[PDB]
Design a protein around this ligand. Structure first.
Ligand SMILES: [Cl-]
Ligand SMILES: [Cl-]
Ligand SMILES: [Cl-]
Ligand SMILES: [Cl-]
Ligand SMILES: [Mg+2]
Lengths: 388, 384
């Protein structure tokens, strides 16, 4: 057991059915999220289209944390049926998934001082609304109001950093959203790792029209977080002719986070906003080495576009929560041990059952480097030092 | 200098303006390729849309072989300006780019025994025709006729293996194109590393309707080659608001097409059903291999039911790779086996080696006999 509490940068709640409706402008009652029932099952119907990002939006019954961990690692014994790995429980047996007081008490048992609390259902909504910019902005605001109500962006006990969503789909309205969440004390905001929807056409994350948003975050010392989402990448499997076809995930994997970080870096977001901090959550860290190779090639062939070294921008401005099976010594060699974050993804089935068991993956590190990975790097990410 | 002649699996001709029209029936005169001119420049106009795969389809002036080496490796020296690199000569001064006799004499000077001769313009046509299945199949047939005429799939001197194109867009017609080229002695065919266009929707390379084509190639011992092409991957840049080049575009494209092509072949069981089928990757690099292996292993662990064989072993057994000059070649041999590494110069392209045999400069970490595998013998195994 560690001698200090940890800071877990990847935790989830399970949204109640009204997370996107409780505070939604009635103008968007059909344009946004609706929960409709066939009598047995509830379906999320988003802009009049049934959405399938979450198989059961009631979240009951609910997967056992970590039951898919050995699977996602490949550690699964021979002849064993993967369907047999999934175990579920009654949602009411786990109030800590939806209730802040219950969650804090579980955090105490888990030895977590501060958890970043991130959406589950909410990570699929923006792709569903990508053709309705006004419904996107209203729905993100409704969600953020719900989030601050049930979880709180950062209540005075400083146990939970609940990250609201910022959509850049309407960049003027986005500056209003950022001002609103910053005024309510947000310490981390999530932007989807995907092309930004547009009225006319989609935009790069580094579009100059987004500069006012990045400037607000950078001046506030609040990082942008990029968490695994529906980023619309099934379009690749679609181009290839695409109950799970095994090809789809091979074609998808970690391409969204790679392309997101490329968009940010190549289009000069960190050049224009050198104080801006970013963090990748639940996207793995395998993307880094290909991204570094490709950035080096781009900077060499078009040096005029790279007044600064894009690899150093990656190393300076970006923190990464790796997957448990990633080569962590190698990652530290590449991005620096100070940029590696512990995140458990609790209570998801693909996450760790016991968050602090992440330390089993750190036997290659000194006691003081483990303290950085398990606690202090996250505090560095959130903070801005007076000396910087 | 080596004491054997080499086998170069990546060489090009430059198509004359009529490669896709000489033997094309008039019914496809507008649906296929036309060369239309504005008084100064000539443009490839494909299915009534101006195409931009090749900057100048007359190929005159013509790039100096190897002058873009530094650029394609991102080894442009400190201080050197990128656009100062391109040098051009006149096409008339290099008949070996379009004339078989002149090319043989140049191969003698280069110490190449056999060259795989591959398209330049031809690698962009299929994407342009992906919405017209009949025009695709007819245009590929017309081109294959032109190829056998000017270069010959495999003339008696056995100096040149000129690979015809096979499109799977109409699978029945594809089987018939395979028979056509095989009967004329083809020893390698090119399939585009890209989704296969369909009347109704695109298909995986491993779609079951493609089995008769793979079966015929596997039984004949003729490999399928996948050469760098317009595979339509600019759609990813497009999704990001893309499409002076925007430097993001190429970061988002890179080697994704060959990765996804090999994934489609292996995951959908082409090598499971056709274990004798040989494939070769040409001008796509070899960096894709490590991520592909990672992802194939994950897929096999997650859905073992779909993977009765080890997909990484299928990669290693059935696939040959001509890597980029600058790739880590000892590492590649550690991963796929030295027997699967092929020398290819990409001559005379600008991004290729000016001197094909200089490829050996990157092989100092290998034994004399392994260099012989890479520069000659592995290609003989691939062909059979
Ligand atoms: Cl700044
Ligand atoms: Cl492409
Ligand atoms: Cl077979
Ligand atoms: Cl290279
Ligand atoms: Mg082997």
């Amino acid at each position: 057991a560690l001698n200090y509490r940890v800071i877990d940068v990847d935790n989830h709640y399970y949204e109640p059915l009204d997370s996107f409706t409780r505070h939604l402008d009635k103008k968007f009652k059909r344009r946004g999220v609706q929960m409709l029932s066939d009598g047995k099952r509830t379906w999320a119907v988003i802009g009049d289209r049934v959405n399938h990002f979450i198989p059961n939006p009631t979240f009951d019954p609910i997967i056992v944390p970590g039951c898919l961990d050995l699977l996602f690692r490949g550690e699964i014994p021979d002849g064993v049926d993967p369907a047999s790995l999934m175990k579920v429980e009654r949602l009411a047996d786990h109030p800590e998934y939806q209730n802040r007081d219950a969650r804090i008490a579980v955090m105490d048992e888990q030895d977590i001082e501060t958890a970043f609390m991130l959406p589950t259902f909410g990570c699929g909504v923006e792709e569903a609304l990508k053709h309705d910019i006004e419904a996107t902005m209203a729905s993100v605001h409704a969600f953020n109001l719900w989030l601050d109500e049930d979880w709180g962006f950062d209540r005075p006990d400083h146990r939970i950093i609940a990250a609201p969503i910022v959509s850049l789909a309407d960049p003027t309205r986005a500056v209003e959203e950022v001002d609103f969440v910053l005024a309510r004390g947000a310490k981390l905001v999530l932007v989807r790792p995907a092309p930004v929807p547009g009225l006319v056409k989609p935009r790069s994350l580094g579009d100059r029209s987004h500069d006012p948003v990045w400037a607000r975050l950078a001046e506030a010392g609040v990082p942008v977080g990029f968490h695994l989402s529906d980023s619309g990448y099934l379009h690749i499997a679609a181009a290839w002719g695409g109950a799970k076809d095994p090809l789809d995930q091979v074609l998808l994997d970690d391409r969204a986070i790679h392309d997101t970080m490329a968009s940010m870096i190549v289009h000069g977001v960190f050049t224009r906003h050198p104080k801006l901090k970013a963090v990748s959550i639940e996207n793995g860290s395998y993307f880094v080495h290909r991204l570094i190779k490709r950035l080096k090639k781009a900077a060499n062939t078009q040096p005029q576009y790279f007044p600064e070294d894009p690899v150093e921008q990656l190393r300076n401005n970006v923190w990464i929560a790796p997957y448990y099976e990633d080569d962590l010594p190698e990652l530290a060699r590449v991005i620096g041990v100070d940029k590696i974050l512990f995140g458990s993804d609790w209570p998801h089935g693909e996450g760790l059952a016991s968050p602090v068991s992440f330390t089993a993956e750190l036997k290659g590190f000194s006691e003081s480097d483990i303290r950085k990975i398990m606690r202090d790097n996250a505090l560095d990410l959130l903070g801005v030092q007076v000396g910087s």
